[PDB]
Amino acid sequence: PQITLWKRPLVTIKIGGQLKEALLDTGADDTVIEEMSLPGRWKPKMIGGIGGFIKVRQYDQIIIEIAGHKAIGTVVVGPTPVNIIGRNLLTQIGATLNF
C-alpha cells in the first residue's frame, strides 16, 4: 500500500504465533518487540534510543508477517514502549520512503 503520515503508521504483525500492533519505523535500525518468548538462542544487547538505553534479548532468524508480507531477520525483545518494525525488516518487504 501507500501509507501517508498524518497518523502513526501502525500495522498488524504476526510473530511467534501472536498478532501484535507495530509501528513502521524508518528511524529504527532494529526491530524491537515488547516482552514475549521466542524460540531458539538469544544473546543480550543494549539499544539506544532518544532517552538512553534499554537491555534486550537478541533472537536471530525470526519470521514476522508484516501487513501480510513475510520477512525473516533479527528481532530484539525488551521493555520498549511501542513495537517497532525497523529497517532490517522494512527492507525485506520492499518498503521505501517517497516524496
Query: What number of other Cβ atoms are within 10 A of residue 72's Cβ?
Result: 12
**Residue found by looking up cell 513495537 in the block:** 83
What is d(CA 25, CA 22) in angstroms, rounded to the nearest whole number?
9
d(CA 17, CA 53): 28
Q: What's the closest the beta carbon of residue 72 comes to a second copy, in angstroms?
A: 16
Catalytic position from the list 25, 29, 30, 60:
25
Which residues contact residue 41 at a Cβ distance below 8 angstroms, ignoring those fewer than 6 apart? 59, 60
Residues that bind a second copy (CB under 8 A): 1-6, 8-9, 23-29, 32, 47-54, 67, 69, 80-82, 84, 87, 90-91, 93-99
Among 10, 11, 67, 82, interactor with ligand G10 by CB under 6 A = 82
Q: Of Na ion, Cl ion, a second copy, none, which one sits near residue 61, judging by CB under 5 to 8 A according to partner kind?
A: Na ion
Task: Tell me the window of 11-19, 29-37, 65-73, 89-97 that interacts with ligand G10 (CB under 6 A).
Answer: 29-37
Q: Which residues are catalytic?
A: 25
